[model samples]
Target: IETVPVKLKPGMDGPKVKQWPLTEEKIKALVEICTEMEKEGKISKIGPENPYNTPVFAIKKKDSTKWRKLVDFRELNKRTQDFWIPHPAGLKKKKSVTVLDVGDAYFSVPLDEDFRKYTAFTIPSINNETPGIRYQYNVLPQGWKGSPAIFQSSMTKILEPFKKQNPDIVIYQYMDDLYVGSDLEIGQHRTKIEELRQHLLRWYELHPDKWTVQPIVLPEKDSWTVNDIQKLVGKLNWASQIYPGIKVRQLSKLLRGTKALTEVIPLTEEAELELAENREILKEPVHGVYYDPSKDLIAEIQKQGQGQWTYQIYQEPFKNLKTGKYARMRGAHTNDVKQLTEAVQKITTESIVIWGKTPKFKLPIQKETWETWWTEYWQATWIPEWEFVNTPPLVKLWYQ
Candidate 1:
């Protein structure tokens, strides 16, 4: 369904390689998988000749009694441009969530006919009578460098209509896993879940040729390489959306250990201890509200004087303003005498005018006052000129 363009480096042709030996057991396994693929119209037998070719092999899946056929496309990957399809960080407020897994997802999408020869690979026959036969993928293959982006882009187009048709349903796609949830108001027609499920099934039935959808349950990592650290940090960042505000500050320390892809920095004992502690933190259930970027309001507290703190409000995901390191729209200050009374006045005014605060919104203002005598004395003698004046210190003191 997705058409991908193959961009090879100038003056370099695509790479070809000889067959890699596979164990008879692995060969038999590949035979069954490939046979199914041929029957499913995912692959086709090519003539003995091809422009480009790659070796195929099988690796046993961890904890599984199955062998996964893979193509060694190292050279192909080097020549092809990277296709990066961005996924939404995570899900948001919903009573329940469900995932639909597409079987052989990448292979479901049709490959570009012009580039099919590049995906050619040789595999031995099950009978050994027809050995060393070459075949090519008619559909996008798993190991191709551009398969993911091709599949994702096509799938997104397929899902666009459904999104518009079901406005009350929240849908998220992470590759082959399609997550669905109800966006209807709580306590109102929760059976919309069944409706959404049936909707997916009906849609799949209509387009049986495009994709196969199976409803499913949805449920790692080490150490200490640049690739390894990048993956770990990436995983943490991904999980941070689900587990908002959960020791992100502490986990960032692990990220600092790995500097770059070529550089491998081992963790110290204290760092490992920190990792173990963070692991304990993860053992606690992923409990919390979903992160809505819309709800994140940034404000900065600046010390103006001995007893005065200025509270300035700004927009979400704070950015630097023209005047300061962080931007703020309106500010209200704390006073020793009035405590937060003056700040409340200013903040409330901004809430009404700038923020348009609704009745339901609660202000995060502290009510307790700093009423000690030292605070009052400090405020009384605290001279703004002493801190901000350009004159000599003694001259500023004389003016104060």
Candidate 2:
């Protein structure tokens, strides 16, 4: 197990549990489990008296009379800081994907002795004949603030070797959800399924030793206020990066009176439908370029001499070839050549290739060479074909 310890605010005693909501059966189970765990040194019944106490509760499992013991760590979480672990957006071109789970994931992590006092929780006497007593966890417990971060940190180390062994395979962990995928086979293409499944199973057995394999929604609002419009549009805008096809800009009318982040604006039924349709059309693996013409603003100025022209290129906006983030490639003004040729030359030099139909720049040079270069660049890059209505004055391309 990795030794990524949980750090809490200094001098802050763990919150006190005024009461617990435990049933008779749950009390018996807790005593049974804790007693056995103490015997195995997974928990300790001995700790400083008046150590910060946390409330214990039980949630019933589905279709069963059994209950799962859980602790309330809300106050503890408030004083804890966590690290940022990026969640995988989605598999890009890798068609084959596999998911693996870890059994008793968080509980497998050993907690630092120095922080055990912060994990103390009270349990009722088994027979309800004695006063309540407190016990502290020696292992990371479920619902603890730092359990996920530490678990993820450890899992990343265990999976890092697989990525290094085969750079083509995509391996990432989101909490306990492990995902591995690759387009090309390690051996034969048809054998990839068995290979990936076996590979994941082996890794699980090495560390977790057990797993439960399982195969694994949004809300809409009515007549909006200013805050509502701001929130809805903000949400749609944020999602726009992953689901580019959703044209969130169309709902600008609903944000007419949004003066501040706190402002609200009302919406008609027609506008809400537009927002809803935008959301419904979204699918995995974002596939389009967001072309902003404002950046590609064209301007021509007459020079001191007659028939002389100066062209200024402001911002050439396009989706990044790899990251898919909106990026603008800026070019300096050119006066020696025609504006169109300058624009094309600048864009092509930056290695921006077309995915859909190549743009017709109406260049002063040979049409054949111009078309040939664009066609070859697009084909060589293997970018997917995309369609756009009202194409921008400047061309844009994105790699999927």
Candidate 3:
């Protein structure tokens, strides 16, 4: 969370700011990549806060929810050219701003043409028969820290040309949360939307069912009497803002019956506050649950080994979920240890050695010195670990 200036000495020139907790080499490489891209016109400039970061513009759905829109508040909002705006369905009139109280919506991945865990279990009944939705029955999806960046960067490349044409179309993209926008005018909105729909179809990469686009709706004038912008009371899920006195009862009420934000505007003063609090949390997930400082070199190396073993053992099963059946549901406790060990060893040799047996990682450094160990060994490179999910059998079988 600390920033250092990029030195501007002769024969060494770069971006102005560098963030700590990242290696100087990696930072310089990132800066160099960005600079080259900028020179080739990939990006305009390093945005606010850090020169290396991209400044993302915000857009709102026609409806409002506990979540707030990313508003850059530049010349884009100054479109006050006084034109009649059509009302959205279910809403009687267009208010200054509309809110849609969406619940905790999760991103899903496509399942096998049939369904089951990503790794087919050996159990016959475990073969997934369902085909329509795949969240729990199939894949865990793109909510992890690095997943969004990978998804968005590729998606941005696919849609960059279209985006360049329509300069005003707002795109608020997180891991899998994509919110696109245009003027409130119906024709303008439909043009942008149809292009998006068709563009997505053309790619045949991300489909409409896998990802959705929608508008926001708000209450009518008669729905409430509050003149000033008021807050609503409700349970919140944005974990970063969780504070003392945030009773568990209230949080339960927020998500008890619903799986998503629908209708249900904030009714109490605490409602808006709760929503705002959650919005802040979504901006940056700082819960620290996914981050493990104690998992040092040996554990990480062990993790890499484990990942190779699991990935190799489950490769065929995970390849085709529909036809694939669960292979290792209960556990591998039979008398086939030799065969299994050979199978694991065969695959381990195929892997790139991100963490192999090494002299430096064996001896322990200072006790409670996770930082020292991380800097010396674990930072900047992608560790050789197979990322796992938490929703279903094979996908959620191991590793959080």
lDDT by candidate, in order shown: 0.49, 0.49, 0.28
Model 2 lDDT at residue 176: 34
Q: Give stretches of model 2 more than 4 Å off.
A: 1-6, 60-67, 91-109, 125-129, 151-153, 161-400
Tens digits of per-residue lDDT, candidate 3, 252-359, equal 344344333434434444644544444444344222222122332211111212322222221121121111111231233442332232232222221211112111
> What's the C-alpha lDDT at position 97 in model 2?
48
Candidate with the greatest TM-score versus the true structure: 2
- Candidate 1 regions exceeding 4 Å error are 1-5, 17-19, 58-68, 72-75, 82-87, 91-108, 124-131, 161-400
Model 2 score (lDDT): 0.49
RMSD of 2: 24.1
Q: TM-score for every candidate vs. truth?
A: 0.38, 0.41, 0.21
Residue 116 Cα positional deviation in candidate 3, in Å, after optimal superposition: 15
TM-score order, best first, reads 2, 1, 3
Greater-TM-score candidate between 2 and 3? 2
Clashes of 2: 7
